[PDB]
Amino acid sequence: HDEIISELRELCLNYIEQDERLSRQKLNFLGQREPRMVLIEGLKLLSRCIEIDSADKSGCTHNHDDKSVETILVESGIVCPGLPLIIPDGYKLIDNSLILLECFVRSTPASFEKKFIEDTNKLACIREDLAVAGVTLVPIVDGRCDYDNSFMPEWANFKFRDLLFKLLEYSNQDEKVFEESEY
Amino acid sequence: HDEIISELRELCLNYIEQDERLSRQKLNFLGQREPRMVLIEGLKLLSRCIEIDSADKSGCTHNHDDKSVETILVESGIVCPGLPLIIPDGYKLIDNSLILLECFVRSTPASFEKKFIEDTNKLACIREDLAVAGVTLVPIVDGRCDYDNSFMPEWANFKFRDLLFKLLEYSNQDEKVFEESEYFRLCESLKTTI
Ligand SMILES: O=C(O)C(=O)CC(=O)c1ccccc1
Ligand SMILES: [Cl-]
Ligand SMILES: [Cl-]
Ligand SMILES: [Mg+2]
Ligand SMILES: [Mg+2]
Ligand SMILES: [Mg+2]
Ligand code: NA
Ligand code: NA
Known part of the structure; x- marks a missing residue:
């Protein structure tokens, strides 16, 4: 130990x-x-x-401080009340488009597809709320099959x-x- | 140890x-x-x-990356060529005013006052170079007499x-x-290559 x-x-x-x-x-x-x-x-x-x-x-941008989508918008001068609590892995506001990134690692095809659909649904549920506030959601789900990364x-x-x-x-x-x- | x-x-x-x-x-x-x-x-x-x-x-803002005043200005789209090399401890551009901060610790009154004057002169020497580029310098020298700080x-x-x-x-x-x-002797002797 x-x-x-x-x-x-x-x-x-x-x-x-x-x-x-x-x-x-x-x-x-x-x-x-x-x-x-x-x-x-x-x-x-x-x-x-x-x-x-x-x-x-x-x-x-990696979501280093675990900000919510609400905070990311407020941070950029965008009002959008009642948005559920979504904390993405990454984000980027360009013009009227908010890129939101979810990423994960899964090691079997069954668990991979399950989590892929879960993260997809997680981002999709605020698309229309964002649209009412003038923000086009650009949702990205990046599923990985192993822990390979450029830092190690x-x-x-x-x-x-x-x-x-x-x-x-x-x-x-x-x-x-x-x-x-x-x- | x-x-x-x-x-x-x-x-x-x-x-x-x-x-x-x-x-x-x-x-x-x-x-x-x-x-x-x-x-x-x-x-x-x-x-x-x-x-x-x-x-x-x-x-x-703390000068996290040791940026120069020139670098701080070019990042906000302000041209100003001259500028001596000056790395402030902190900075903030608000409107047309550039706050620049130097801080130090000294443990005797004579060394405190000497260093205060030095840092004050270091910042003051670019006031007019900034004024030509349209920037009002707001120079701050924060002299401390001990090491206390909010992080410890x-x-x-x-x-x-x-x-x-x-x-x-x-x-x-x-x-x-x-x-x-x-x-150590081998380091001395490596004087085979002056
Ligand atoms: O990054 C994400 O998107 C998460 O869903 C949370 C996450 O990765 C995590 C990692 C380790 C422990 C608990 C949650
Ligand atoms: Cl959908
Ligand atoms: Cl010093
Ligand atoms: Mg996450
Ligand atoms: Mg310093
Ligand atoms: Mg200093
Ligand atoms: Na909702
Ligand atoms: Na636009």
Whole structure:
């Protein structure tokens, strides 16, 4: 556990590119001491790498601060009340067009298509609200089939995931030592 | 000394506020291994906390990327060629007025007043160059007498500085040991290529 956490921190500091948009989540990760919290912030760190790559590939701004669509519009001088709470992975306002980006990773075709339709529906549900406010929605769903990203060599991506999986294994191995113990 | 470095890192992670403007320098600091580089980046981290604190209390933008005044103007579409190279600690363009901020810490009254005059002159020397380009300079010099800032509790600021000083003492001993080493003689002798 201590060794796994140490190896994870070393990968984070030495083998994830120092793009400044990642620095906050790296610090969030490096600050964690509890295994369950290392795992949680490590998955989030991997996710941000994917999100920022998707934003750069899709031509918009990564939603670094988890702003809502409401805030993004207000931020740009656009009133649109009653908009449900939607926090996109990326966004870009060009003229009257609001690009909204959702991205994800899934590892089987069934889970891929399910999440693809979920994120599509999530953005689609504010199209008409945006249209009433003069904003044409440009919704983008970028589904990935693995965790490959431009900020990490493939071998270090793999080692990071292998190490996170060991923390998962220990948790699950922990409670089967709970389940054959208990009541 | 490994323990001192570890303590500085814990203070950085646990007691320096998670302001997004500090992310880069905090990460730069946490990645250092060599005692002297830990010391330099730790001092730079503390300086960054004060500079950003000053920008916030003076109502302007911290100069996150060390942009020059010329660069700040060309980003807002203002031409102005001349300009000496000047990197303010903070800036804000409002209407036709360019706020420029310099901040510093000094620990004696004589050094405080000397530095205040220096920074005041540094900014004043471009007032007319800006006025020709249509810009009213609003120059601010924020001189501080201690290291307090809003991103660190007072006790942690004190203990961070205490541990940096102990790390200074340790790296001074590393240097003296190094100057007794063959590596040092080999560095001297590499004077085969002046
Ligand atoms: O990025 C997104 O679009 C999400 O849907 C949230 C997300 O990625 C996430 C990642 C890690 C933990 C919890 C949510
Ligand atoms: Cl639809
Ligand atoms: Cl100085
Ligand atoms: Mg998201
Ligand atoms: Mg400065
Ligand atoms: Mg200064
Ligand atoms: Na609605
Ligand atoms: Na238009």
